[PDB]
């Protein structure tokens, strides 16, 4: 409707400290650091009390007003990602052939191997994004854990671990094989 002054609020907890010059956003805290460019979006950040940040948008169109709310979230997720961390648990299932997932340190880049999946001699090598760590679930059969700071690194790498395990030209119902994200959560549960 052409608003005049559209602002949100970004609540900053006591651990983390935000730095925003132009539209580049740093979140320095307990777990480490996160930097993000937001020049593409074009808004106005306003520190108010070291504890609340207001992004405003003047003379906005509906499409520019939208762009504002998604900025609160994408800074919120940069804050929650350091104080609390992001952990994604993936359980993998099968019918006959047990999937023999391992991690290789080839060229120091860290990949995830996918072997024998639905009886494959094709070994599916999946990259691991930096920031995100991999560990196998102890005392739980056939399960792998993806834990990192950023929501992107984590969930995208979860997605690349899942999408490699389609069943080519078969049934959805009959064939159960693959890797699926079981549980979405936090590193520090509180």
């Amino acid at each position: 409707m052409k608003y005049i002054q559209t602002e949100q609020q970004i609540e900053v907890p006591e651990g983390v400290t935000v730095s925003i010059k132009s539209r580049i956003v740093k979140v320095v805290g307990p777990r480490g650091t996160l930097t993000k460019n937001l020049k593409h979006i074009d808004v106005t950040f306003t520190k108010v009390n070291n504890q609340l940040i207001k992004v405003a948008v003047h003379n906005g169109g509906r499409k520019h007003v939208a762009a504002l709310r998604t900025v609160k979230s994408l800074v919120d997720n940069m804050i929650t990602g350091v104080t609390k961390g992001y952990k994604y648990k993936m359980r993998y299932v099968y019918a006959h052939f047990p999937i023999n997932v391992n991690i290789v340190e080839k060229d120091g880049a860290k990949f995830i191997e996918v072997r024998n999946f639905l009886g494959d001699k094709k070994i599916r090598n999946v990259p691991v994004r930096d920031g995100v760590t991999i560990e196998f679930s102890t005392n739980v059969k056939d399960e792998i854990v993806l834990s990192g700071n950023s929501v992107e690194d984590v969930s995208q790498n979860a997605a690349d671990l899942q999408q490699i395990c389609r069943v080519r030209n078969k049934d959805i119902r009959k064939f159960l094989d693959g890797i699926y994200v079981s549980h979405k959560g936090f590193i520090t549960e509180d």
């Binding site: 359980r91 959805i172 119902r173 009959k174 159960l176 693959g178 699926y180 079981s182």
Partner: protein
């Protein structure tokens, strides 16, 4: 190859780990994909879609009216 071969598979192994998620999310995306398709889909693909969408709209007009007229009786 029995008589309910896939239904047993369900009643013994389950659908998927993720079959409720892909389903539910596809139900939501539809509202967008419909609008994307009614904006795209040039030519005869679209001229059928708009005519499909109208028969979907008169059917709904009937269903709403014939329910709220027989609310009294």
């Amino acid at each position: 190859p029995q008589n309910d071969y896939i239904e047993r598979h369900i009643k013994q192994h389950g659908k998927r780990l993720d079959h409720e998620e892909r389903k539910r999310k596809r139900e939501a995306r539809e509202s967008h994909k419909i609008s994307e398709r009614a904006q795209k889909l040039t030519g005869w693909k679209g001229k059928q879609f708009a005519k499909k969408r109208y028969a979907e709209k008169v059917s709904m007009r009937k269903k709403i009216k014939a329910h709220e007229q027989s609310k009294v009786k």
